[PDB]
mmCIF file of the C-alpha atoms, coordinates in Angstrom:
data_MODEL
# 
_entry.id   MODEL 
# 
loop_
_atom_site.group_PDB 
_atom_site.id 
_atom_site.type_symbol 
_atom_site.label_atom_id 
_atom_site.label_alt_id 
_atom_site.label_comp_id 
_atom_site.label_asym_id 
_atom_site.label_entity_id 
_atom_site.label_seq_id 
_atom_site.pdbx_PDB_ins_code 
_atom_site.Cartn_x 
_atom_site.Cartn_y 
_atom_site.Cartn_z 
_atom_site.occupancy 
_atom_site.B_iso_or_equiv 
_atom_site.pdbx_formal_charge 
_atom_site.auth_seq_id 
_atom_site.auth_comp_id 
_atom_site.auth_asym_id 
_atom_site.auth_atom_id 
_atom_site.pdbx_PDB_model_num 
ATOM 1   C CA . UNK A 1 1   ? 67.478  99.742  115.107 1.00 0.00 ? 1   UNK A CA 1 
ATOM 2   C CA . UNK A 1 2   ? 70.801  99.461  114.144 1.00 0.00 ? 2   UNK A CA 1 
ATOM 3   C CA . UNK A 1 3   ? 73.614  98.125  111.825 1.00 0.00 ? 3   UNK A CA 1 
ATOM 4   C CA . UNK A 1 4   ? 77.172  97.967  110.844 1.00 0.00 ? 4   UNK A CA 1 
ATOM 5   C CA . UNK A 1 5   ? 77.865  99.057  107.664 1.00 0.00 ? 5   UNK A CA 1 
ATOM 6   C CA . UNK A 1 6   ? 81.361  100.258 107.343 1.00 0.00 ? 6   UNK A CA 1 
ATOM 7   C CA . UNK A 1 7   ? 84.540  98.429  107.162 1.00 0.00 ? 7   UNK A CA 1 
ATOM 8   C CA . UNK A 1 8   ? 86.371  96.949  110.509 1.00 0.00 ? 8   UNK A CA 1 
ATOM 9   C CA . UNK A 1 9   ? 90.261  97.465  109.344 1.00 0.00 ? 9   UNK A CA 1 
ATOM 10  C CA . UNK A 1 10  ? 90.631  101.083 108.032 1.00 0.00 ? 10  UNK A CA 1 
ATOM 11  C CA . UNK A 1 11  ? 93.617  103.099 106.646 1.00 0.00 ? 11  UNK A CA 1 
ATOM 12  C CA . UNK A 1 12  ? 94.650  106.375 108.069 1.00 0.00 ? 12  UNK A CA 1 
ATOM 13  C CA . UNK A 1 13  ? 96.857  109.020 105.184 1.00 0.00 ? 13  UNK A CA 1 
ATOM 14  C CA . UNK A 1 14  ? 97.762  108.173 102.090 1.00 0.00 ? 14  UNK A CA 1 
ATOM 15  C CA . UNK A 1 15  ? 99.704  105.309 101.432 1.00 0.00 ? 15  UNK A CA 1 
ATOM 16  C CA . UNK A 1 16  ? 103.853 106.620 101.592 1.00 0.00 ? 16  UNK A CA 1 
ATOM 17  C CA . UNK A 1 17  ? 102.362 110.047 101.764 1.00 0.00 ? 17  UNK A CA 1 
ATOM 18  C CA . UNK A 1 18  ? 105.614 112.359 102.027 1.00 0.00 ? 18  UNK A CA 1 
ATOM 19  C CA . UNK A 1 19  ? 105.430 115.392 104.291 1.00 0.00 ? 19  UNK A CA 1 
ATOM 20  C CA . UNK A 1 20  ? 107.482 118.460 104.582 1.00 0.00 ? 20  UNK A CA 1 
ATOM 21  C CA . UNK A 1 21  ? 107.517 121.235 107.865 1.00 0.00 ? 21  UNK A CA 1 
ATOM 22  C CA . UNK A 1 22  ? 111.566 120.072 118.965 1.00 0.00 ? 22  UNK A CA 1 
ATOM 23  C CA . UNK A 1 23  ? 109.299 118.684 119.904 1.00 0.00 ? 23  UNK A CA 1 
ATOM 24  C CA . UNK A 1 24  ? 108.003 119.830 115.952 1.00 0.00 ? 24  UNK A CA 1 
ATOM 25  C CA . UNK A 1 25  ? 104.452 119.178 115.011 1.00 0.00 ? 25  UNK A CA 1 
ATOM 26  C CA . UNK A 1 26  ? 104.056 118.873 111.412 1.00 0.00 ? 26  UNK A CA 1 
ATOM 27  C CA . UNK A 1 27  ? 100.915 120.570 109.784 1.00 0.00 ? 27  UNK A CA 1 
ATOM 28  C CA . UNK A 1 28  ? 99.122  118.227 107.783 1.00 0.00 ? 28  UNK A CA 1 
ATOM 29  C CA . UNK A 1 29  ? 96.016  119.187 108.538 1.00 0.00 ? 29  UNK A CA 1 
ATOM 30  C CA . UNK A 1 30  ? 93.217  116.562 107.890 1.00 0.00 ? 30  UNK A CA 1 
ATOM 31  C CA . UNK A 1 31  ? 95.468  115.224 105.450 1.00 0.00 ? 31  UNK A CA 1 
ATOM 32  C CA . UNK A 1 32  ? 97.048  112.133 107.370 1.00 0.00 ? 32  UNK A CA 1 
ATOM 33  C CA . UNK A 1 33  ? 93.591  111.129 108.641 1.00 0.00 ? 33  UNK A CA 1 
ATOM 34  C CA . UNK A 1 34  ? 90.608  108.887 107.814 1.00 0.00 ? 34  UNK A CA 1 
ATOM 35  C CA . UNK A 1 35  ? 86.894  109.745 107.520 1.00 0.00 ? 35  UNK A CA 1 
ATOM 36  C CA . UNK A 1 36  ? 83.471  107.950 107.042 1.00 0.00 ? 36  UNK A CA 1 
ATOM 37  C CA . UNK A 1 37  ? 79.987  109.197 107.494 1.00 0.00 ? 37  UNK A CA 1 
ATOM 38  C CA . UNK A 1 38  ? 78.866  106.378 107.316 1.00 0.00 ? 38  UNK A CA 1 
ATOM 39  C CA . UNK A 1 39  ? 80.087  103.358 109.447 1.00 0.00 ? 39  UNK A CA 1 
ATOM 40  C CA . UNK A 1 40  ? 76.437  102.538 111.462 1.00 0.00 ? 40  UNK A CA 1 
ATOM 41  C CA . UNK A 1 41  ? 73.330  102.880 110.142 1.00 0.00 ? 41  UNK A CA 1 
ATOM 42  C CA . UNK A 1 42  ? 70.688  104.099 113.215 1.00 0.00 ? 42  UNK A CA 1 
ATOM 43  C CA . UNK A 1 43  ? 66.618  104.864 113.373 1.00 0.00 ? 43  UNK A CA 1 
ATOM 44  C CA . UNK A 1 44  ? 63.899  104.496 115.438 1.00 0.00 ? 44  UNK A CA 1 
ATOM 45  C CA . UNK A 1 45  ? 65.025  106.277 118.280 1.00 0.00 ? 45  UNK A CA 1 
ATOM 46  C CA . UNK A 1 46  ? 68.701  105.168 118.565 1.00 0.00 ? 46  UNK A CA 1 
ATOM 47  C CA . UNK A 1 47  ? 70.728  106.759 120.457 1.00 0.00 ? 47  UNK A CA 1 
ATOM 48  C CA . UNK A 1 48  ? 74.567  106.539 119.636 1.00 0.00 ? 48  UNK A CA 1 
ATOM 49  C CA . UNK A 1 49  ? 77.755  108.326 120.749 1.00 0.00 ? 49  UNK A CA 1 
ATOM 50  C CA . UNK A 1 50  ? 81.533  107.095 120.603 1.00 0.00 ? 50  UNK A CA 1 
ATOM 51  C CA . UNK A 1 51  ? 84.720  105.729 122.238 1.00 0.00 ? 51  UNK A CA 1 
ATOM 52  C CA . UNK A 1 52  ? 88.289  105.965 121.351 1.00 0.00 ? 52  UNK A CA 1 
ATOM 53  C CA . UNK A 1 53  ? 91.153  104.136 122.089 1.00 0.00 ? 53  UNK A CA 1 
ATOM 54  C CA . UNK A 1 54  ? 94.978  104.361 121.271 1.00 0.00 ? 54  UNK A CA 1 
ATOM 55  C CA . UNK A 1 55  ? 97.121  101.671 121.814 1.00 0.00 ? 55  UNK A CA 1 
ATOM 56  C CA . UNK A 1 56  ? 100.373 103.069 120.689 1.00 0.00 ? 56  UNK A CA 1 
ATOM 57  C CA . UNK A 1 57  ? 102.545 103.950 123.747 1.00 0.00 ? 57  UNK A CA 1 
ATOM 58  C CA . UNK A 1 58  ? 102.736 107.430 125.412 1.00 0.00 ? 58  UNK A CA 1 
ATOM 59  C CA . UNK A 1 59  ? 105.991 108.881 125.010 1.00 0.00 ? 59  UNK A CA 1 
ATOM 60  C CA . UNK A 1 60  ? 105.036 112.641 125.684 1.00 0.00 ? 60  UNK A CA 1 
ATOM 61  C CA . UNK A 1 61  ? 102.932 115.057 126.237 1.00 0.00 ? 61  UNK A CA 1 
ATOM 62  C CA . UNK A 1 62  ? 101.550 118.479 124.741 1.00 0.00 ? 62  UNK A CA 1 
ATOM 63  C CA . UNK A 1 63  ? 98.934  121.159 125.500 1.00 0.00 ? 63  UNK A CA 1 
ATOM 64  C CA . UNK A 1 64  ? 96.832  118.497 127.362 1.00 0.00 ? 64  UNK A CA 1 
ATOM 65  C CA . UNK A 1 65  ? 96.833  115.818 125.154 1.00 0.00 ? 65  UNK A CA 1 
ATOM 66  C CA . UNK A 1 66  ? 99.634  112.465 124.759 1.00 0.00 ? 66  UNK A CA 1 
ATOM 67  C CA . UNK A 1 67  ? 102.296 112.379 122.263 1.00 0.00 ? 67  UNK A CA 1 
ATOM 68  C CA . UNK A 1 68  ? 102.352 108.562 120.846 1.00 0.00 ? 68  UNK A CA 1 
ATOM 69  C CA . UNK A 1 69  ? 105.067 107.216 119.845 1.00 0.00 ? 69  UNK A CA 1 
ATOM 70  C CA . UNK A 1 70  ? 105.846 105.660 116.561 1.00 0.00 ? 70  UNK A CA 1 
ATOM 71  C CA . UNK A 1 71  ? 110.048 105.543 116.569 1.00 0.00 ? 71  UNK A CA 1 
ATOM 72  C CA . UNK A 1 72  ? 112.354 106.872 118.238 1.00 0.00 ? 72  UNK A CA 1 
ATOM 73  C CA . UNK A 1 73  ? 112.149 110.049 116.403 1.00 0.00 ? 73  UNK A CA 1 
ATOM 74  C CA . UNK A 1 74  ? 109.261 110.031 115.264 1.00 0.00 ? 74  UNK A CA 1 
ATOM 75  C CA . UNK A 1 75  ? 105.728 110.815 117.132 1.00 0.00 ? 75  UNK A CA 1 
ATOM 76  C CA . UNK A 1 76  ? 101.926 111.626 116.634 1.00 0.00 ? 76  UNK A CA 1 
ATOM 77  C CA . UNK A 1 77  ? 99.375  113.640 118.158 1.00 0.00 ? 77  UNK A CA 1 
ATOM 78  C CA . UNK A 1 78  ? 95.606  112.289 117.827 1.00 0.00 ? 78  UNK A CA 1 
ATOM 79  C CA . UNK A 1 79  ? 92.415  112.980 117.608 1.00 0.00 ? 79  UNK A CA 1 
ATOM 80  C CA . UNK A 1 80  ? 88.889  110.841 117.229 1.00 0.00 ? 80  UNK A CA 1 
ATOM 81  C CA . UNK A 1 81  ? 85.435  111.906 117.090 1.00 0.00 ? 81  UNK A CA 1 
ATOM 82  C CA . UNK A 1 82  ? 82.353  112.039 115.061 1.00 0.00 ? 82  UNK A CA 1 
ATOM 83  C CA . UNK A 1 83  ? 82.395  112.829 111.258 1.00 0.00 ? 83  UNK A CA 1 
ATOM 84  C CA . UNK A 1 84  ? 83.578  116.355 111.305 1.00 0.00 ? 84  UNK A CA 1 
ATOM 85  C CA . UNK A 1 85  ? 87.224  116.501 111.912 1.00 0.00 ? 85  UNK A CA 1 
ATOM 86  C CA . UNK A 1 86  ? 86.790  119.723 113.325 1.00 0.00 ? 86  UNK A CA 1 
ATOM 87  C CA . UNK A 1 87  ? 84.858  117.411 116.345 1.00 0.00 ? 87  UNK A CA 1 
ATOM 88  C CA . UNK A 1 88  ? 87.876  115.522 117.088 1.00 0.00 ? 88  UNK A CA 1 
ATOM 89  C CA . UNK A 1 89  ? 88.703  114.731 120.437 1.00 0.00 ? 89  UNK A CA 1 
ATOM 90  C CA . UNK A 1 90  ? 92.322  115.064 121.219 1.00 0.00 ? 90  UNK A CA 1 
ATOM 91  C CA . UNK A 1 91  ? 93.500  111.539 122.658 1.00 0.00 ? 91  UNK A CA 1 
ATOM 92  C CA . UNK A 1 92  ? 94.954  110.717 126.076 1.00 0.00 ? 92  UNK A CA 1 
ATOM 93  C CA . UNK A 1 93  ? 96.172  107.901 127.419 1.00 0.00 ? 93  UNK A CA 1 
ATOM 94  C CA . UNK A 1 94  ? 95.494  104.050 126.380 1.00 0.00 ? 94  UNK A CA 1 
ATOM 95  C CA . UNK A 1 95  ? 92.289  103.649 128.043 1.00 0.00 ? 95  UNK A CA 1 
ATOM 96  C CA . UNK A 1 96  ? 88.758  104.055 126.298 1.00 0.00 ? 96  UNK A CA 1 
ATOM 97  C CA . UNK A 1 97  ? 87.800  107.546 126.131 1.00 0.00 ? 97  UNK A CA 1 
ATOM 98  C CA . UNK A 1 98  ? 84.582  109.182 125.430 1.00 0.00 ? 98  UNK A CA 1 
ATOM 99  C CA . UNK A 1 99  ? 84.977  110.939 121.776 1.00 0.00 ? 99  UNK A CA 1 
ATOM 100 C CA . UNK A 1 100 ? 81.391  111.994 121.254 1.00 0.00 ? 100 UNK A CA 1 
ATOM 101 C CA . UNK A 1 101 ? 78.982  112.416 123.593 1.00 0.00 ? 101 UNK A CA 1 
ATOM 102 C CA . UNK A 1 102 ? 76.801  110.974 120.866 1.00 0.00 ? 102 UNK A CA 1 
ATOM 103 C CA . UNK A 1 103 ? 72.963  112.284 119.296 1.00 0.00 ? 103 UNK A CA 1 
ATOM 104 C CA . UNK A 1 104 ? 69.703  109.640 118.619 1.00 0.00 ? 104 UNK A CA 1 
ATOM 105 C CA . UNK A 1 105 ? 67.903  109.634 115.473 1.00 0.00 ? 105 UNK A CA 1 
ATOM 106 C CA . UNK A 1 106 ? 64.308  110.722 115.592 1.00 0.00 ? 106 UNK A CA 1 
ATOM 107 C CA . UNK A 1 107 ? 61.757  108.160 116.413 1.00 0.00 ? 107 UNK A CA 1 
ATOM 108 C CA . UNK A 1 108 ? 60.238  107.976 112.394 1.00 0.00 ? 108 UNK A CA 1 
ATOM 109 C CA . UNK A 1 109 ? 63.737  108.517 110.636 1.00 0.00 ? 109 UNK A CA 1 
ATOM 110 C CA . UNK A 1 110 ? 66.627  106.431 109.726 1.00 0.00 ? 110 UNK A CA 1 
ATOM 111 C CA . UNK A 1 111 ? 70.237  107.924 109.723 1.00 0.00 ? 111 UNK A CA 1 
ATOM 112 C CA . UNK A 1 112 ? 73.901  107.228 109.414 1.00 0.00 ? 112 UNK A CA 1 
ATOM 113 C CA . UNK A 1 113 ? 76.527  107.608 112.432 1.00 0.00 ? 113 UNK A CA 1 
ATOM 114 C CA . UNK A 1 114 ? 80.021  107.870 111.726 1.00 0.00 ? 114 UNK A CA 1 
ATOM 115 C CA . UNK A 1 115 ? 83.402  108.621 112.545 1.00 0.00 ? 115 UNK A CA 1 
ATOM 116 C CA . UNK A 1 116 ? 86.774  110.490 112.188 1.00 0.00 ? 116 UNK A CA 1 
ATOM 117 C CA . UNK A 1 117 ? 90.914  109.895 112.857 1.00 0.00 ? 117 UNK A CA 1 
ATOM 118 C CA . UNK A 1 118 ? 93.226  112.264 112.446 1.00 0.00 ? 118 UNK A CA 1 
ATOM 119 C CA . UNK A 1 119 ? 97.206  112.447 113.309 1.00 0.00 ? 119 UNK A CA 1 
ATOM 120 C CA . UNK A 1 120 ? 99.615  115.064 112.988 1.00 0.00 ? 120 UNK A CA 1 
ATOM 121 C CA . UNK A 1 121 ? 103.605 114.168 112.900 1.00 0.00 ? 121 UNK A CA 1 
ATOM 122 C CA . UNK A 1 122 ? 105.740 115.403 115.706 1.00 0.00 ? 122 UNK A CA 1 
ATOM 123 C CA . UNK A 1 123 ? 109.576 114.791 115.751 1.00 0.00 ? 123 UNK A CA 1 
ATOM 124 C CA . UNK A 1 124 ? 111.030 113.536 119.358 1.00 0.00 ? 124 UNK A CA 1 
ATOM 125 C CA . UNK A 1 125 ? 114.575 113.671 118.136 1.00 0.00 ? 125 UNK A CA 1 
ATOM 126 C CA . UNK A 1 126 ? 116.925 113.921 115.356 1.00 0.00 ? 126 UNK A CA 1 
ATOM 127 C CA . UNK A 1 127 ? 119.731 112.735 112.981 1.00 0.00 ? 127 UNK A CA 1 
ATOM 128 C CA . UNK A 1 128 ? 120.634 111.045 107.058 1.00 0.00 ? 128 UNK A CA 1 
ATOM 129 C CA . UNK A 1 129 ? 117.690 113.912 107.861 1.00 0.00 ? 129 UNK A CA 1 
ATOM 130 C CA . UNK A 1 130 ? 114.007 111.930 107.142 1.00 0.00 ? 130 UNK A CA 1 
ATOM 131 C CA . UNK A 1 131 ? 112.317 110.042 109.054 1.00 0.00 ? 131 UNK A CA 1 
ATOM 132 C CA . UNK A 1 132 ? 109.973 107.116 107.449 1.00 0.00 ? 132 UNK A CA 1 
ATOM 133 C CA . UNK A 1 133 ? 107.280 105.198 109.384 1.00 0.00 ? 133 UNK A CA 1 
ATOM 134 C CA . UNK A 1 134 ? 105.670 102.271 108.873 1.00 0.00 ? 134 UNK A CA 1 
ATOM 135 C CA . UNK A 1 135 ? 101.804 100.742 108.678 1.00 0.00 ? 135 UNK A CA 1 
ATOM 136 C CA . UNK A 1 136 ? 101.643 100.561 111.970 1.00 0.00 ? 136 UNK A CA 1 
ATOM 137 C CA . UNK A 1 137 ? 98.214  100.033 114.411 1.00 0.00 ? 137 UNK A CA 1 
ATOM 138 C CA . UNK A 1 138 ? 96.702  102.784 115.905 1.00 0.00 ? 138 UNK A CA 1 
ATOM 139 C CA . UNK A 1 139 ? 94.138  101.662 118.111 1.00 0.00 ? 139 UNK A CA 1 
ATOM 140 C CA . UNK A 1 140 ? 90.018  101.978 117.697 1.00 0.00 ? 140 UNK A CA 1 
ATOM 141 C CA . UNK A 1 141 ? 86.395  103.369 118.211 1.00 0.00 ? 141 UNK A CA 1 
ATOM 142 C CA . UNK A 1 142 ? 83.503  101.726 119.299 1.00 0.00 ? 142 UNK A CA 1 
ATOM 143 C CA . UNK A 1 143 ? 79.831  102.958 119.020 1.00 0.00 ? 143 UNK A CA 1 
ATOM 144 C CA . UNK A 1 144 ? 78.018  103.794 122.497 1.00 0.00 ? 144 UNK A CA 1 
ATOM 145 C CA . UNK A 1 145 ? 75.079  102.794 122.588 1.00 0.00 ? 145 UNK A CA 1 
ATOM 146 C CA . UNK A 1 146 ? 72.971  105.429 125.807 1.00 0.00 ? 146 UNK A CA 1 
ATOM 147 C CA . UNK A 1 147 ? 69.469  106.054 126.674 1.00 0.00 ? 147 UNK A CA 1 
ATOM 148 C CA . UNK A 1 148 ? 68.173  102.108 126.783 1.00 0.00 ? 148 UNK A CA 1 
ATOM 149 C CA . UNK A 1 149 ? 69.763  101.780 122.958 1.00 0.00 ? 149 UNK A CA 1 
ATOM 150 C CA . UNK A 1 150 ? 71.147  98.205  122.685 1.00 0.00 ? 150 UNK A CA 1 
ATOM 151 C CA . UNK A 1 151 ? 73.415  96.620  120.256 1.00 0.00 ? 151 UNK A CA 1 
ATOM 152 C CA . UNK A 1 152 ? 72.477  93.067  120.106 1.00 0.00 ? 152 UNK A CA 1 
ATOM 153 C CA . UNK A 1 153 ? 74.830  91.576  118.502 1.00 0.00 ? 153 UNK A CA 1 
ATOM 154 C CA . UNK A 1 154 ? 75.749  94.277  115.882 1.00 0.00 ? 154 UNK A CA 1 
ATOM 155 C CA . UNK A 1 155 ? 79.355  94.778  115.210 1.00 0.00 ? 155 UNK A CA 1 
ATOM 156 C CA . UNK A 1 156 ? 80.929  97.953  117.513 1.00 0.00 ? 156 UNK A CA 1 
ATOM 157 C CA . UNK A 1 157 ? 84.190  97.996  117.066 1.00 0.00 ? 157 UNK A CA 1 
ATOM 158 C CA . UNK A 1 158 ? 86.563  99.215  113.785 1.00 0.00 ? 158 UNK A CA 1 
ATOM 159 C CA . UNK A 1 159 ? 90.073  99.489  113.494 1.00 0.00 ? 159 UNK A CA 1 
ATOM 160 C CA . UNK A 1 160 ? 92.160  101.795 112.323 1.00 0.00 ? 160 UNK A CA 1 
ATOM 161 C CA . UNK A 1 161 ? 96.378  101.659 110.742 1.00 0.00 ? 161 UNK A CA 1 
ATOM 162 C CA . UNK A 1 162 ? 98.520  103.894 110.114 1.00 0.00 ? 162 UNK A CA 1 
ATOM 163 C CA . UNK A 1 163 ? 99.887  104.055 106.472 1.00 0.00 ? 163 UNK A CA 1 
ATOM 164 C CA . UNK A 1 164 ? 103.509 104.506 106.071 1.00 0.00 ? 164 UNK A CA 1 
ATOM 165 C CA . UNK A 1 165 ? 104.927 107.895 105.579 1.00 0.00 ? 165 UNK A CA 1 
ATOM 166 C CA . UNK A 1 166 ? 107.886 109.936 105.573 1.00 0.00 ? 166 UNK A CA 1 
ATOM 167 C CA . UNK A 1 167 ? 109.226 113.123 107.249 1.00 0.00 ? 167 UNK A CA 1 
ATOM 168 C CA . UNK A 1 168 ? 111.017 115.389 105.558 1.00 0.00 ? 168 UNK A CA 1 
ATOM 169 C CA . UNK A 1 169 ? 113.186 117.771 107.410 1.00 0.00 ? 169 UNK A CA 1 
ATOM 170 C CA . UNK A 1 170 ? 114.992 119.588 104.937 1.00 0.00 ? 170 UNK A CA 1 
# 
């Protein structure tokens, strides 16, 4: 079985977290990002991977992966995944987009699934000499259910906003 036990509207960095170092990528590590083990609570057999999407506009690209854009000097570079923010999937794109190809609880266990978002700051152009940002939508991840693993008519789907920041660039 399965069900939702996490929270649909989630916060990504600290509230007016302030950050310090083009295009420039900050690096803030896991620091403007939000995590949760436990968002979906699986057993018997369930099988369960994830989907991304961003819905902020690409404005950019880099290594592979888009640059979305916030301002007009201001940027991010995302990634979604499972737990681990070292699983992150670097997001393209505005479509949904596989994140983590997903694992199924043994057949006599119970487990948690959940999930990680994580953005690093990247200036598109310059200048006063900070840049703030703020709570803006990011987009979301839904749970895949695979291998005959159904849903019903559990929640999938959580959201996830950006809290406002600021740039400091000297």
């Amino acid at each position: 079985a399965v069900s939702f036990i996490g929270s649909t509207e989630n916060d990504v960095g600290p509230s007016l977290g302030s950050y310090s170092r083009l295009p420039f990528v900050y690096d803030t590590r896991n620091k403007i990002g939000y995590q949760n083990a436990n968002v979906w609570h699986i057993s018997k057999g369930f099988c369960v991977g994830l989907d991304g999407k961003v819905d902020l506009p690409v404005v950019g690209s880099l290594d592979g992966q888009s640059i979305y854009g916030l301002t007009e000097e201001v940027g991010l570079l995302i990634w979604m995944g499972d737990t681990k923010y070292s699983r992150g999937t670097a997001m393209s794109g505005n479509s949904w987009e596989n994140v983590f190809s997903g694992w199924c609880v043994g057949a006599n266990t119970a487990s948690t699934q959940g999930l990680s978002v994580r953005v690093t700051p990247v200036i598109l152009k310059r200048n006063s000499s900070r840049y703030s940002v703020q709570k803006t939508s990011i987009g979301s991840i839904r749970m895949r259910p695979y291998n005959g693993s159904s849903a019903g008519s559990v929640q999938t789907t959580v959201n996830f906003s950006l809290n406002p920041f600021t740039l400091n660039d000297t």
